[PDB]
Amino acid sequence: LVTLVFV
Amino acid sequence: LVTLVFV
Amino acid sequence: MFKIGSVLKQIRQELNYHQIDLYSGIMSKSVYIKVEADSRPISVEELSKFSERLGVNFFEILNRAGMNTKSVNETGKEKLLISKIFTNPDLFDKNFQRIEPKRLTSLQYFSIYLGYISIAHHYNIEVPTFNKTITSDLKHLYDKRTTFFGIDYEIVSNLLNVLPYEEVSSIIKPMYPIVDSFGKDYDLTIQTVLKNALTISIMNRNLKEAQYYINQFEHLKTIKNISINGYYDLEINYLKQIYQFLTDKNIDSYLNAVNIINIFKIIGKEDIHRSLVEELTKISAKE
Amino acid sequence: MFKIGSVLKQIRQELNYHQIDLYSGIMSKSVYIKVEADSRPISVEELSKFSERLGVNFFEILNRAGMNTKSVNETGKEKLLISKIFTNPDLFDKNFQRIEPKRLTSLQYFSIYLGYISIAHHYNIEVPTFNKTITSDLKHLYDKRTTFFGIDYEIVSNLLNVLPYEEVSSIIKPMYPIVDSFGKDYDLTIQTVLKNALTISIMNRNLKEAQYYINQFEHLKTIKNISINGYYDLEINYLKQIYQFLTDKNIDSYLNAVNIINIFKIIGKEDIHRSLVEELTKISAK
C-alpha cells in the first residue's frame, strides 16, 4: 500500500 | 517467549 | 519552552535522591535549584549528565518534559491538522490557502503540502497550482543535495502518492542504500519510501525496479541499531511474495501472500486487512 | 560531550541556509559561531528552536550528534557487554565481580545485574549472592515507589526471567494500566513485561492472570502516540490464541496460533520461529 507519513 | 531487554 | 527541571525534580524525588546527588561535579546548588525551578535553561550536555545520575533514559525525560507530542511547534500542529481535513474535506480550501505559499520554507512544510495534494486528489478537489510547480519545486529542493534526512524520506514517501513513479524515481535512487540509523522516525520514513515504491512497482509490473526495493529493505535489516517496523516487514514480505508469483509463476507464493494478509485480520488490524485485500484483487489485473 | 554544533553546521550548509537564518531572534552571531564551533554548549530550548529553523527532526539531530548509540555512557557499554558474555561465558566471572556490587546504584545497573543472573542461570554458573539478596533488593528498590519509568519496566521484564512469577507479580500489578507513552523505548519495555508475563501465565496455566495481561496489551493499543511493536503484536496474539484454545477447547484457535507462528518463518525471522515452535510444543504439556 502507498502509505502517507507525517512525523 | 520470555525476552530480556536492554535499552 | 519545556519544564525539564520540573521533570528532573519529579524523578529525583520519586527515586529519593537528594539535590546534592545531582548537581555535584556539574554545577552550583543555587544554579541547580534554578534548573528545577525552570528559571535557568538547561544544556543538552547537562541533561545528559543528569539522565545518568538518575538512571532514567535521556529521551524519556524529554518526552516527559513535553517533546513526545507534536504540538510543540507550528509544523506539528499542521501535520495533525491533515487528519482533520482528510475526514472533513469542506475545511480544505481555507487551510490549503494558508499552507500552499509556505510549502518551500522548510522540508517540513513541503511534506504537509504533499499531504494536502493527496487529500485533494482523493476528493477530486481542483489543484492547478500543483501541476504547474511540482517539477520546479523538486528541482529547487533536490538538484544540489548530498545527504538525506528523515523528512526527505518522508517527503518522497508522500511524493510517490501524488506523482507518477517515473517522475520520482530519479530522486529516490541517490537516497539509497541506507548505511546508518538516526532514530526510530528516520527508521520509519526510510522504510516507508521502500514500502511505497515496492507497492507501485508491483502494481505497474516494473519487476526489475520492484526487486531493487525488496533488496533495499533486506539491507535495512542488516543495519546495526535500525528499528525495523513489524507491520512493514509483513506488508513488504507479502509484496515480495507477490513478486515471486509474478516472476516464477509458482502458485505457492501467491498462497503465502494471502496467508500473510490474513494474519492482519487475525491480529485485529481490520482496516489494514481490508485495504490489502482490495490491493491484492487490484494487483491481479492492473494499475 | 557531543558535537551538536557541527551537526547543525552540517545540516545548515546542506540546506543552503545562512548562519543568519539560524541565530537571528535567538542569539548573537559571535555566539552562534561558537555553537557550530562546539565551544559553547547549547541549551535544549536552543536546539529545539534550531530544529524548527532547519525543518529537520529534533531527535534526529540528536542521533546524528551521537545519542543514537548506547556507548555514550558507562551503563550502555555494560549493556552491550551482556551479548559478548552471553555468547562467550568464560568471561562471566571477571565481569560479574565488577557489576554485582554496583547493582543498587542506578536502576540501569540493576537491569544489567539481572542480565548477568540470566547468563548464569543459562550456563548453570553458581550465583549464591543472588538468592540471598533479591528479596531485600527489590524491597529496597520498590517498597516506596509511586510512578514507574521505562527502566523499571525493563527491570521487571528481566526480573521475570530469573524469579518465579509468584515473587514478581506483586511488583507488576501497581505498574499497570499504562496511561501515556514516553518514547519508543518506554513503549518497548511496557510491552515486554506484558509479553513476558503472558508467556509465563500461559506456561503455568494461571489463565486468570494470563487474561489480565492480554487485556492490558489491548489497552495499550488505545493510547495515543503509543508505538506498538509489530513482532510483539504477533507473538502476543499467538499467546492470546493459545489462551482461547485452553479456555474454550476449540481447535480453530490452536490453528490460528500455529498459522501466526509460521508467519514468522515466512518473513525470515528464522531463530524466533524456532524459539516459538519449541515453546508451542512446551505449552502442550508443562
Automatic annotation (TrEMBL), chain C:
Pfam families: HTH_3 (PF01381), PrgX_C_TPR (PF22459)
Domain named HTH cro/C1-type: residues: 7-61
Source organism per UniProt: Enterococcus faecalis
GO CC annotation: transcription repressor complex
CDD domains in the record: HTH_XRE
InterPro entries found in the cross-reference section: Cro/C1-type_HTH, Lambda_DNA-bd_dom_sf, PrgX-like_TPR, TPR-like_helical_dom_sf
GO biological process annotation, one example: negative regulation of DNA-templated transcription
Recorded GO MF terms: DNA binding
Keywords: Plasmid, Receptor
Protein name: Helix-turn-helix domain-containing protein
TrEMBL record, chain D:
Claim: GTP-binding is one of the keywords in the record: no
Leader peptide range in chain numbering: none
One Pfam family in the UniProt entry: PrgX_C_TPR
Organism in which the protein naturally occurs: Enterococcus faecalis (Streptococcus faecalis)
Domain of life (superkingdom): Bacteria
Domain annotation HTH cro/C1-type: ranges: 7-61
InterPro entries (UniProt xref): Cro/C1-type_HTH, Lambda_DNA-bd_dom_sf, PrgX-like_TPR, TPR-like_helical_dom_sf
GO molecular function, one term: DNA binding
CC annotations in GO: transcription repressor complex
BP GO annotations: negative regulation of DNA-templated transcription
Keywords: Plasmid, Receptor
Name of the featured protein: Helix-turn-helix domain-containing protein
SMART domains xref list: HTH_XRE
Record CDD domains: HTH_XRE (cd00093)
